[PDB]
DNA sequence: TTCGATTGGATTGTGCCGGAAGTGCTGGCTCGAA
DNA sequence: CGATTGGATTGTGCCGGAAGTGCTGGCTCG
C-alpha cells in the first residue's frame, strides 16, 4: 500500500488527508513541526475510514526521519505571515531536500508552498531527485476556478469545460482564451451566439486571477479546492492514470526557457511526469508567458 | 427513489442493469417479451447489491403494465442484424411500446437504442407523445468513445482527456469532426504539427471507429459493455441534474438547416430533460457530410 | 437536485459540504450567523466540482431565508464547551421556528450539543414530524470503537460492527454482547487470545474519552462528525435503509417515553422507517436508564 | 499498474473485466482457449475506459504465454457439460496445464480459483501450480453469503450489505448455513424473529433458496454471472489494495474444524500479502458435523480425477 | 538571569494551560536559548 | 469426421443467407 507523507498539516495537509482516506489511496503521515497537533488530527481523520468503508494507516509525525520508504511526499509546509519569506522558506527547502534525499529519494514529489515556481526548484535542487520526479500545484487549481465560472455562466458541468492556464502560479499566470472548449467546443462558438460575451469572459478572467485574495477578503482561506487538485495529481501518479494536468515542471527550452519552473501541460503517470506538452503560443501569449517566468527569475534571486 | 426501466433484458439490457446497481442509481425493471429470463438475470444481479453496498431493487417482468411510474425508460427491444427490411417490424415495435408509455409514464425521460436509431428515436417520439425535451437517441456518446480511445492510445493519455464530436447519424453516414478533437483540451492540430501522430493515423483511426461494431462482430463478439456505458452515462445525466454535454439524437427544428427529423448533436442532458440543444458552426464541407447523414436517416424513414 | 442546507459552518460544516461535493448528493447552502466567512468557505468549496466531476452548487448564507425548499437541514450552530444549556435552547427556538416556516417538510440531522437535549427542543419548536429529525450520536461513537478494535484484531474497520447507546456523551451504553469481526461474535476472538477482555474494556473508555484524547493533542474532532452525519444524510437521500444508531424519540422503548435516546434506526427515504429496540439483559437496561436519566437531568436546566 | 489475468473469458469474465475498468484496479488479459472471442470482448470493453474514466489496458489472448508478470489470476475456465463427476478428471486435465504455467510464469500471483467443484479444483491447482497456501483460494463463501445476506435484508427492509451473515465448508449443494451467526445491522437475527418481524419457518425457507439459487436462475433460462463476478472482483480488490475485509473463502485446511490436505470454506482475511489469517469458528456439536459432510463430498469429488 | 515561544489552531487567540464569557481572550505557567 | 474450457436472435468448429422473438446448409481442417 503506497505510504503518502504530508510535509505539513496546515488547513490543506488536513484536507488532502480526509481526501486520502475517503480513495482509499493510501497511508497517511501527517507531519508538522508544530508538535502534537498533527496527531490529533490523525487520529480523528483516522475513525473516518469507517464511514468510507477503506483502509489507511493515518498517523501524525514532528520526526522528517518518517519520510523513510515515503511513495508520495506533498509539501504545503512554509511561512506566509511578501519577498521577505523567500529566505525563511527556502531554508525549509533544503531541510526537507536534505531528508528526501537520505530517506525516500525514489519519492514522487508535489510542492505547494509559495511561490510555488521558486519553491519546488529550491526542493528539485536540494533533494536531487530526477526532473520528472517533482512538480509544482498550479494550473490545476486555477484552471478549476476557470472551468468553474464558465460553467455557471453557460449552464453545463463544471468538467465539461476545459481550460488551460499556464507560466506562473499567481498574479502573473497566463490565461489562454484560445484554448477554452465546452464539452469540446471552442468557446468562440458561445460568443457568437450570445451565451456569453467578450466582457463576460474579461471578467471571468479577472475573478480566476483574484479568487484567493476574493476568499481571504471573506474572511475565509483556499484549501478545499487546493487540496482536491493536489489530490488528483497525486492519484494520477498513484493508479497510473496519465492525466492531463497544467503543473509546475523543469523547463528545458519550452517556451524559450530553461534552468526555470514553469506551469505547463504535462501527463502525469506511474513513471511520474511522462510528457511535458509545449503549447504552440502566438506571440502575444509568449510574451505573458515570459513575464510570468521573469517574475520566477526575479523571485529565486532573492533567496 | 428513481424507476428505471429497461425495455429489452439482452446483453446491453444486463450490463446497464449491473451498472445501475453499482452505482445505486435507482430500482430497476428489467422487461422484455421473452419469458422468464429476464427474472432470471434480474435474480442473479439483484445479489450484488450486495457487493456494491447499494439497495436497487432489481426485477424481471414480462408485462408492459410495469411501466407504470417510470422515471427512466431505455428500449433496446427489436429485430437486430449484424453489421432495411427491419424497419417495418420495428416500426410496429414502437408503435406498441409508445402506447403503452403515453399510458403509464408519460412523464419519464426516454433513451432510445433500437437500430437504425435516428429513425427509431423519431417514431417512438411520435407515438409516445411525449415533449421532445424527454426523448433522445443513442449515438454520439457510443462512437466517441471509440475515437477518444483510439487517439488517447496513440497519443499516451487518459482516455478521457481526448475530447471528440461525431455528429449526424448513427451508423456508416456518421460525421466525425477532425476539427473538434482536442487532447487535454489542446487542439489535435498542436500534436499533428509536432508529428506525435499524423493526419494518416489519424483517417486510419476515423476508419476503425466507424467500423467498430463490424471489427467486434467478425471477432465472434457482440458490442454491448460500451453501449450499456454509454446509455448509463446519459440515464445518470438526466437523474442527477448534472447537465452534461453529450452527443445524442435529437429532434432537429432549423439545426444545420434541418426539420421534422432526428439527428445527432452536443446536448445538455440535465434534471428538465435536454436542456440545450448545440448547433455546431460547422464549415461548408462538415455541413455537406452532416446532410449526408441526415438524407440517410430519410431515406430509411420513408420505408417503414 | 436535494437541497441541503448547513446551519452552522464552522469546521465541521466545512467537511460536511466538502463531501456533498465529492458524493455529489446536492446543493449546499452553508449558513451561519458569522457574515461573509460561510460566503467564502462556500466559494472555494465550489471550485471542488471540477476535481470530483460533480455539479453541486455550493453557497454562503447569513440568512434563514434559504431555508426555504431545503430537503436535509443539519445543524450544527451553538455555543461550544471543550471536553450553556439555556444560551443553546434559545438557538433550537430561532432555528425551529423558521423551519416551521419555511422548510416544514426537511428531514433534520442535530448535532448541537449536548445532543440528546438538543434535538429534543429542536423536534418541540419546529414542529416535524417525529420520524423526520434525529440526533447525531452512535455512528461517530461506534466508529470509534469498531475503528480501535479493528487496528487490534487486524481487519478491515468497517468489519467490526457495534452498538453504542442511550445518549452521546459520558455515560453512552457500550454494549460488548454485540461486537461482530466480520459477523463472528468478539468473544470468541477473546476465547482465542486474539484480544483480551482487559485490552477491550481499554478500547471502550479510550471510545468514551476520544473527543478528550484529540482535545488534549490541540486538535478538535470534526472530519469523523462530518463523515458521520453525511453517512445519515446519505442513507435518507439515496433511500438505502442502512441500520444506524442514532437519537430518536423515545415512546416506551427502554421503558421510557418523552425523550429522545441513542438506538439503531433505520434510515430510508421517508426518514426514519424502523426503531429497532435491543432485547437488553437487566445490567444493560440499567446503564441505558442512567444514560436517559442524565439527559432528562439536563433537560431540566433550560 | 497491476495486471489481472481473466482464465476464461466466458460471461463471469467478461463481468470481471467490465467491472475491472470500472474501479480501474488494473490491466485486464481476457484469456480464452476459443480463438477470437475473448479479442472482441476486450476491444469492446476497452471503449468503456471513457464513460468509467479509466485507465486500464483490456486484451485478449490465446496463449498461456501472457500469464506472464500477473499480479492475479482468475480462473473459471473449464467444462460445465459433457463435451456430474464425468468433468472431473477433464478438469484435472486443465488445472495441471494452467499449473505448470503459473509455476514457469507468474509463480508469485495471487490466484482465485472459480472452476467448478471449486473446493476440489482450487486444491488441484495448488498442488500444480506450487504457490504458496497463503496466495491461493477459491470463490464460495462471499457469492452464497451474498444471496442469503439478500434475501433475508429484503424480508427485514434494511440495506442488503447490513446483514451479515457466514456460509461455512463448500460451495456447492453441502454448503453450511450457520443460523446462529446472522446479524442485521449488528443485532442477532433471534431478536428479530422474537419480535415477529420474521419466523424460523421463512427463515429456513430462505436457506433453502439460498442453496437454491443457481437451480432457480438456470430454471428461469438465465445463468448466474453477474453477482459471481462481483463477489470475484470484491476478493480480488481486498488483495490488491491491501483492505484486510474478511470475507468467506476456500483456503487450504491444515487442522481446522479437524481437517488437512483438504480446501474448505471459512473466514479469511484478504490483505496485501494474501491471505493473512484463517479464522477458525467455535462451531458447535451439530455444525461440525455439516462441515464434516461437506469436507467428506469435497474428498469423494476429489478421489474421482 | 532575562524573555521569547516552529512552518498550526478551537469560539475566542494561538509556546502551553485554565477560567471566563457567551458569536466569545488573556493571566500565569514551563521550557530553553541567548 | 468431429470440431477448446464461448456465443449473437437463432445455435454454437467456421461462415452466409434466411426468417423475423427468430437455425441450418455448405464448408475446411486437422
Ligand atoms: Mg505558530
Ligand atoms: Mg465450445
Known amino acids: 500500500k503506497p505510504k503518502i507523507v504530508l510535509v505539513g498539516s496546515g488547513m490543506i495537509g488536513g484536507v488532502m488527508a480526509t481526501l486520502i482516506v475517503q480513495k482509499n489511496l493510501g497511508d497517511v503521515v501527517m507531519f508538522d513541526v508544530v508538535k502534537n497537533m498533527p496527531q490529533g488530527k490523525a487520529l480523528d481523520t483516522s475513525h473516518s475510514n469507517v464511514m468510507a468503508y477503506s483502509n489507511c ?39 526537507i531536500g536534505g531528508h528526501i534525499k537520505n530517506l525516500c529519494p525514489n519519492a514522487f514529489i508535489i510542492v505547494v508552498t509559495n511561490p510555488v515556481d521558486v519553491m519546488v526548484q529550491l526542493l528539485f535542487e536540494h533533494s536531487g531527485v530526477p526532473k520528472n520526479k517533482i512538480i509544482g500545484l498550479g494550473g490545476v487549481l486555477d484552471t478549476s476556478r476557470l472551468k468553474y465560472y464558465i460553467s455557471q455562466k453557460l449552464n453545463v458541468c463544471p468538467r465539461d469545460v476545459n481550460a488551460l492556464i499556464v507560466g506562473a502560479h499567481g498574479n502573473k499566470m497566463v490565461l489562454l482564451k484560445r484554448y477554452i472548449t465546452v464539452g469540446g467546443i471552442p468557446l468562440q462558438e458561445f460568443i457568437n451566439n450570445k451565451k456569453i460575451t467578450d466582457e463576460e469572459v474579461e471578467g471571468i ?99
Not at 77 to 85: E, P, V
Not at 88 to 95: P, T
Open 57 to 95: 494507516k493515518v498517523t501524525g509525525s514532528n520526526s522528517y526521519d518518517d519520510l523513510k520508504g515515503a511513495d508520495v511526499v506533498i509539501v504545503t509546509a512554509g511561512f506566509t505571515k511578501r519577498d521577505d519569506l523567500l529566505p525563511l522558506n527556502n531554508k525549509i527547502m533544503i531541510e
Open 205 to 303: 478572467f479577472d475573478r480566476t486571477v483574484n479568487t484567493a485574495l476574493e476568499i481571504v477578503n471573506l474572511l475565509a482561506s483556499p484549501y478545499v479546492a487546493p487540496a482536491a487538485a493536489i489530490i488528483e495529481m497525486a492519484e494520477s501518479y498513484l493508479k497510473d492514470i496519465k492525466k492531463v494536468l497544467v503543473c509546475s515542471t523543469l523547463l528545458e527550452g519550452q517556451y524559450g526557457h530553461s534552468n526555470i519552473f514553469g506551469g505547463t501541460p504535462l501527463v502525469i503517470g506511474g513513471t511520474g511526469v511522462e510528457q511535458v506538452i509545449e503549447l504552440q503560443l502566438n506571440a502575444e501569449e509568449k510574451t505573458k508567458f515570459d513575464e510570468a517566468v521573469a517574475e520566477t527569475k526575479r523571485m529565486k534571486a532573492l533567496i
